[PDB]
Scaffold this motif. Structure first.
Motif, mmCIF file in Angstrom:
data_model
loop_
_atom_site.group_PDB
_atom_site.id
_atom_site.type_symbol
_atom_site.label_atom_id
_atom_site.label_comp_id
_atom_site.label_asym_id
_atom_site.label_seq_id
_atom_site.Cartn_x
_atom_site.Cartn_y
_atom_site.Cartn_z
ATOM 1 N N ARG A 64 0.728 -1.123 0.062
ATOM 2 C CA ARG A 64 -0.057 -0.194 0.162
ATOM 3 C C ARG A 64 0.884 1.167 0.075
ATOM 4 O O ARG A 64 1.878 1.085 0.410
ATOM 5 N N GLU A 88 -3.504 5.692 -0.999
ATOM 6 C CA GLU A 88 -3.481 6.217 -2.322
ATOM 7 C C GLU A 88 -3.627 5.014 -3.204
ATOM 8 O O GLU A 88 -4.222 5.403 -4.333
ATOM 9 N N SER A 89 -3.113 4.008 -2.822
ATOM 10 C CA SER A 89 -3.490 2.617 -3.690
ATOM 11 C C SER A 89 -3.162 1.220 -2.765
ATOM 12 O O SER A 89 -2.409 1.678 -1.846
#
Lengths: 121, 518, 380
Positions: B254, B264-265
Motif C-alpha cells: 500500500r 493512495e493505492s
C-alpha cells in the motif's frame, strides 16, 4: 543471398546484414554516426577506459569537420551537430569543455580528450 | 488525498522468496536477493538479465552492489558475505560477515565500508579494500537485525532495525549505538531514512500491522500509518513523491500519502507475501520482494505541468516561491539562451483545488487549475474565480477560449467560455482526447476528428495519435503519432458539404473533408 | 566447414574433450586449446578474441574454457549462438566445467558437438534432444493494327515438337471521329498452354456460327485484348503455332574431327525473315573450325564455344562446317542450338479477318502489320 529492397523484414539475422547494406547506400566520410555497428563495438574494448576514449573521439569527429590543420583533425560531416549558435540552448560548448582536461576523467580518456579539444576548435 | 502516480510493472521475475531488493547504486540494474541460494540481477530497462551469482546453496537474504569496485556483496545463510565481480564473473572475496545469516547489507560508496546486519544480534563492518577485513563490530542490538540503512546526511551514521522494538542510530566510530529510538512496539523490521540533505527522518515497520514515521531531529513520532491489514513486513519512504510504500505478508503493498495518510493505492500481484521494499534514491522506481518472486515497479510523475502565456506569467505548481495547493509563478527573465534562466516568480492569488495539471492561457487572460475531475478558472493576473467546470483532463485548444475536456462519459467534450458545448459530442465513442480545432477522439482503433460545428465525423486517420494540435487558422493540424508526425489539411469547404450531408461514417468517416498533406 | 572444431578446454595446457567433425584437427586441436585458452584465449574478458590467425570464442568456467574456434565466419550472431546452446548442454552432462568430470563424459560432450555443429555448420540442440541419443475529322478516320508476338520452342533432333508457346498482343491505333462501334473477327485459337486477357470495353458475342467480338475503341493506341482468344494472350505455339524455322542438325564423326551440317528451313519462300542467327555450339577441345555458308556471315567464337551464323534476311538457307578436335575423354553429348529471328507474320497464326467499324462511313485500314520475334527457341 544478401541485399534487400526493404528496410528489413524482421529478426537479428536480417538486421545484421542490413547495417552492411546501409553503409553501401552512404559510404561518404566514414559512417559518421555509427549505425547498428554500435552494439558489437563496445565489447571490442571491454577493458575499460579505452571504450570511452574511443567514444569521445567519434563524438568529437561528429561535432563538425573543421579546417583540419595541425591537430584540428575533425572529419565526419560539416553540419550534423554544428558548432556555435548564440541562440542554441544549453549549447554545444558544454560537451566541448569535457575535452579540455587536466585529467578530469581518467588518463586514457585524458590523452584522447586533450587532442580532441585541440581537434574541434 | 490526490497525488500524480502511475504504477507500472517494470520487470518481474519468479523465484523463491526474495528477502532483499535493491537498486544498483548508479546503474539502471536492480538486484534481488533470493532464497535460491542465488542472487540475481536484472536490468529492468532493456529487460536483459545481466548476471546471477551463486552465493550459497542455502538462502541469500541480502544483496547490494559496491558499484566503485564493480563488485556485489551478498550475505547468505553461509553466515558469510561473499563478494563477486559482476563483469569478470568470479568470486572476488569470501569472508564470514557474522555468526548467523545476513539479512541486509548497506554500502557506503564514499567510504570502503559495508555494514551488514545479521540475526546474530550484531551488525559488523567490513572494508572491501583491506580484502574484507573486519573494520569495526557494532554491539548494541539484543535481537535479530532485520535491516540496515545508511543515513544520507552523515554516511558515518546508519540505523539498524532489530526485532527488539527499537531502531538504534549508531555511528561507525562507536561500537555501541550512540542513541536509541523506540520506534515500534512489536519489533522493528526495517529502517530507512527519508532521503536528502535536510531530512532527518526514520521509519519503523513492525508486525503489529503498522508502519510508524519518526522524526530523528525532534525524536517524536510524527504519525502512525495503518500500513496494512496484516503485519507490516517492511515500510520505506519514496524520496521524491510524498508517500510511504509498505509491504505486508498478506501479499499487499500500500501506498500512503505522507500528508494525511489516506490510502493512495492497494496493489496485489498474485505473487503475495511482500517481505521487503526499497526505493531508488534518484527516485520513481521502488522494488518489492515477494515469496514467489521479485518485482521492480515504476512510479508515476515523470514530467511537470506548466504553461507560458504572453503576460510573462509562466505558471507551474510546487517548486520555489509557489506552493502546490495555491498557484503562482512568473518568468519575466530573458537572460542568455545557453543556460537555465532564474525562477523570476511573481506572486499569484487564490486557488481552491490541487493541480493535476496547472496552466496559463496561451495569450494570457485565464489561468486554469485542473484537478480531481474538476477545473477551476482563475483570472490571468488577478486570480479571482472566473469560472469552473468539469475535467478529468483539460487541454486548451488553439482557440483557448474553447477548450477540450474529457468529462469521461465516453464522449470527448468541448467547453466554450468554460460552459459546456453539446453542439460538440462525437458520434464515435471515446477512449481519449486530443485538443485543437478539430477535436481528435480516439476510439475503436481510430482517431476521429470532430467538428465544432455540428459534431460529425470529418475523417478518421487510421493511426491513432499521441496528440492533435491544430493551427490557429484551423486548416492545418499537426499530429503526434506513433507513426511519427502528420500534417493534415482540413479543406473547409469540403468539410461544410460533407458534414451537412453527413456522408462521413459514424466510426470511419469520410476520407474527403480532410486530406493528408504530409 | 567454417567451424574447425568445437572444443572444451582446461587451461591445464590441454584440450580436455574436443570434436573434429571430419578428420583434420586431431592432435592440432590439443595444441591450440592448450596454449590460447590459458591466457583467457588471450582475451581481456571479451567473448571474441583472435590469436595466431584463429578466432576463439569463449566463456570461462573455473580453470576451464569452453571454446569455439573458427577461422572463417558467416555471421556475427551465429558463432555465439552455437556456443551458447553448447553452454546449456554442457552442465547437463558435467555440472559446470571441471577437468575430471569433463573427462568422464567425453562421449556425452562429443556426441553433442557432432549434433550441434555438423560439418562446421552450426545446427541447434537442446537438453531434451540430447536425450534420444544417449538413451469533325472523319476524313482522317484510319485504323492500324499491330500484332506483336514472340514464339518459344523446344525441339528434338528428331523434330519432336516438345513444348512451344506463343506470346503476343494486338495493339490497335485508331484515329476515328465520333464513337464508333467496331467488330473484330479473327481465326479460332486453341492453346495447350494458357493465358488470355481482354481490354475493358470488350464485349463477347455469341453466334450460332463463327465467333465475333465487338467494342468501342479507345482513341489512340491501346491493347485491344479483344474477346475471343483476346488481343493480349499467351497462346501455345504448340497450339497451331508455326515455327518459322526448323533446324535439322546432322552431326557427323569425321573421325578425329567432327563435321556438322546444319539445315535451316523457312516457311513460304516468299516470306523472308530478318535478324536470323543460328547458334551451333562446339565442344571444348576446339582446335579451329572451317565454316562455309552460302548466305550471310558465319563466325566461330571460342570462349562461347559456339559457332554463330548471322543472316540479315533470308528466304531460307543452310550452313556447314568442319571441326578439328583434340580428343580428350570420350564422345560428348551435344547441347542444343538456339536461334533468333524476326518474321513479318505471327506464328500464333493470328489473322485479322475483318474489323468493321460503324457509327460512320468506311474508315481506311491503312495498315495491319505483324512483328514476329523469337523467344527461347531451342532445338537439339
Amino acid at each position: 543471398v544478401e541485399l534487400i529492397y526493404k528496410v528489413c523484414h524482421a529478426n537479428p539475422s536480417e538486421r545484421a546484414r542490413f547495417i552492411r547494406c546501409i553503409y553501401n547506400l552512404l559510404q561518404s566520410s566514414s559512417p559518421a554516426v555509427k549505425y547498428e555497428a554500435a552494439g558489437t563495438l563496445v565489447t571490442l574494448s571491454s577493458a575499460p577506459t579505452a571504450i570511452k576514449a574511443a567514444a569521445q573521439c567519434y563524438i568529437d569527429l561528429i561535432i563538425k569537420e573543421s579546417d583540419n590543420n595541425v591537430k584540428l583533425i575533425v572529419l565526419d560531416r560539416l553540419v550534423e551537430l554544428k558548432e556555435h549558435p548564440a541562440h542554441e540552448r544549453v549549447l554545444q560548448d558544454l560537451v566541448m569543455d569535457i575535452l579540455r582536461v587536466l585529467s578530469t576523467p581518467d588518463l586514457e580518456v585524458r590523452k584522447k580528450t586533450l587532442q580532441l579539444a585541440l581537434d574541434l576548435v | 488525498m490526490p497525488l500524480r502516480l502511475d504504477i507500472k510493472r517494470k520487470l518481474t521475475a519468479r523465484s523463491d522468496r526474495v528477502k532483499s531488493v535493491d537498486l544498483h547504486p548508479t546503474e539502471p540494474w536492480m538486484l534481488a536477493s533470493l532464497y535460491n541460494g542465488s542472487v540475481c540481477v536484472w536490468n529492468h530497462e532493456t529487460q536483459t538479465l545481466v548476471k546471477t551469482f551463486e552465493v550459497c546453496d542455502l538462502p541469500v537474504r541480502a544483496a547490494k552492489f559496491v558499484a566503485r569496485k564493480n563488485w556485489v556483496v551478498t550475505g547468505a545463510d553461509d553466515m558469510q558475505i561473499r563478494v563477486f565481480n559482476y563483469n569478470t564473473l568470479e568470486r572476488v572475496h569470501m569472508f564470514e560477515a557474522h555468526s548467523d545469516y545476513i539479512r541486509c547489507i548497506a554500502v557506503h560508496p564514499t567510504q570502503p565500508f559495508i555494514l551488514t546486519s545479521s540475526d546474530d544480534m550484531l551488525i559488523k563492518l567490513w572494508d572491501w579494500d583491506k580484502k574484507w577485513s573486519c573494520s569495526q563490530v557494532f554491539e548494541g542490538h539484543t535481537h535479530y537485525v532485520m535491516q540496515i540503512v545508511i543515513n544520507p546526511k552523515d554516511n558515518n551514521q546508519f540505523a539498524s532495525a532489530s526485532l527488539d522494538r527499537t531502531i538504534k542510530v549508531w555511528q561507525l566510530g562507536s561500537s555501541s549505538p550512540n542513541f536509541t529510538l523506540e520506534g515500534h512496539e512489536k519489533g522493528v523490521n526495517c529502517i530507512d531514512y527519508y532521503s536528502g540533505g535536510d531530512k532527518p527522518y526514520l521509519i519503523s515497520g513492525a508486525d503489529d500491522r503498522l508502519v510508524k514515521i519518526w522524526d530523528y531531529q525532534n525524536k517524536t513520532c510524527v504519525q502512525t500509518l495503518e500500513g496494512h491489514a496484516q503485519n507490516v513486513s517492511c515500510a520505506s519512504f519514496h524520496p521524491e513523491l510524498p508517500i510511504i510504500i509498505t509491504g505486508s505478508e498478506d501479499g499487499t503493498v500500500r501506498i500512503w500519502h505522507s500528508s494525511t495518510y489516506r490510502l493512495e493505492s492497494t496493489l496485489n500481484y498474485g505473487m503475495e507475501r511482500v517481505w521487503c521494499v526499497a526505493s531508488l534514491r534518484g527516485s520513481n522506481n521502488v522494488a518489492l520482494g515477494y515469496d514467489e518472486g521479485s518485482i521492480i515497479v515504476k512510479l508515476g510523475r515523470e514530467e511537470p505541468a506548466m504553461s507560458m502565456d504572453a503576460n510573462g506569467k509562466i505558471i507551474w505548481a510546487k517548486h520555489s516561491e509557489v506552493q502546490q495547493a495555491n498557484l503562482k509563478a512568473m518568468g519575466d527573465t530573458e537572460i542568455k539562451d545557453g543556460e537555465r534562466l532564474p525562477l523570476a516568480v511573481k506572486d499569484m492569488g487564490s486557488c481552491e483545488i490541487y493541480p493535476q495539471t496547472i496552466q496559463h492561457n496561451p495569450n494570457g487572460r485565464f489561468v486554469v487549475v485542473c484537478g480531481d475531475g474538476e477545473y477551476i478558472i482563475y483570472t490571468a493576473m488577478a486570480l479571482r474565480n472566473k469560472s469552473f467546470g468539469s475535467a478529468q483532463e483539460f487541454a486548451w485548444a488553439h482557440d483557448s477560449s474553447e477548450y477540450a475536456i474529457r468529462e469521461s462519459n465516453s464522449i470527448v467534450k468541448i467547453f466554450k467560455n468554460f460552459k459546456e458545448k453539446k453542439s460538440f459530442k462525437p458520434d464515435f465513442g471515446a477512449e481519449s482526447i486530443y485538443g485543437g480545432f478539430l477535436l481528435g477522439v480516439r476510439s475503436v482503433n481510430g482517431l476521429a476528428f470532430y467538428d465544432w460545428e455540428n459534431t460529425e465525423l470529418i475523417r478518421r486517420i487510421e493511426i491513432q495519435p499521441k496528440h492533435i494540435f491544430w493551427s490557429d487558422s484551423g486548416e492545418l493540424v499537426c499530429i503526434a503519432t506513433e507513426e511519427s508526425f502528420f500534417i493534415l489539411k482540413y479543406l473547409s469547404e469540403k468539410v461544410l458539404a460533407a458534414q451537412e450531408t453527413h456522408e462521413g461514417v459514424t466510426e470511419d468517416g469520410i476520407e474527403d473533408a480532410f486530406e493528408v498533406l504530409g | 566447414m567454417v567451424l574447425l572444431a568445437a572444443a572444451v578446454c582446461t587451461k591445464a595446457g590441454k584440450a580436455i574433450v574436443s570434436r573434429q567433425f571430419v578428420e583434420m584437427t586431431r592432435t592440432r586441436i590439443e595444441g591450440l586449446l592448450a596454449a590460447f585458452p590459458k591466457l583467457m584465449n588471450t582475451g581481456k574478458q571479451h567473448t571474441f578474441v583472435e590469436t595466431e590467425s584463429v578466432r576463439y570464442v569463449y566463456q570461462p568456467m573455473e580453470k576451464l574454457y569452453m571454446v569455439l574456434i573458427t577461422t572463417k565466419n558467416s555471421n556475427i550472431l551465429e558463432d555465439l549462438e552455437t556456443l551458447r546452446l553448447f553452454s546449456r548442454v554442457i552442465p547437463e552432462y558435467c555440472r559446470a566445467l571441471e577437468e575430471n568430470e569433463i573427462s568422464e563424459h567425453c562421449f556425452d560432450l562429443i556426441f553433442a558437438f557432432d549434433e550441434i555443429v555438423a560439418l562446421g555448420y552450426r545446427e541447434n540442440v537442446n537438453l531434451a534432444q540430447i536425450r534420444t541419443f544417449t538413451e469533325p475529322p472523319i476524313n482522317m478516320e484510319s485504323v492500324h493494327m499491330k500484332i506483336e508476338e514472340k514464339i518459344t520452342l523446344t525441339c528434338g533432333r528428331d523434330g519432336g515438337l516438345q513444348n512451344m508457346e506463343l506470346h503476343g498482343m494486338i495493339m490497335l491505333r485508331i484515329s476515328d471521329d465520333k464513337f464508333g462501334r467496331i467488330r473484330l473477327h479473327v481465326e479460332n485459337e486453341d492453346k495447350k498452354g494458357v493465358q488470355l486477357q481482354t481490354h475493358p470495353n470488350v464485349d463477347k458475342k455469341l453466334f450460332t456460327a463463327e465467333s465475333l467480338i465487338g467494342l468501342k475503341n479507345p482513341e489512340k493506341s491501346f491493347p485491344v485484348n479483344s474477346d475471343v482468344g483476346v488481343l493480349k494472350w499467351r497462346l501455345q505455339t504448340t497450339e497451331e503455332s508455326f515455327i518459322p524455322l526448323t533446324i535439322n542438325c546432322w552431326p557427323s564423326e569425321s573421325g578425329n574431327g567432327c563435321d556438322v551440317n546444319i539445315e535451316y528451313e523457312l516457311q513460304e519462300d516468299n516470306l523472308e525473315l530478318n535478324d536470323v542467327v543460328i547458334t551451333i555450339p562446339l565442344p571444348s577441345g576446339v582446335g579451329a573450325p572451317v565454316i562455309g555458308e552460302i548466305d550471310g556471315e558465319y563466325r566461330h567464337d571460342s570462349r562461347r564455344n559456339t559457332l554463330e551464323w548471322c543472316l540479315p534476311v533470308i528466304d531460307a538457307k543452310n550452313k556447314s562446317g568442319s571441326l578439328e578436335f583434340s580428343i580428350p575423354g570420350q564422345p560428348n553429348d551435344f547441347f542444343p542450338v538456339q536461334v533468333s529471328f524476326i518474321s513479318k507474320k505471327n506464328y500464333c497464326n493470328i489473322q485479322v479477318t475483318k474489323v468493321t467499324q460503324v457509327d460512320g462511313n468506311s474508315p481506311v485500314r491503312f495498315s495491319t502489320e505483324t512483328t514476329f520475334l523469337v523467344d527461347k527457341y531451342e532445338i537439339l
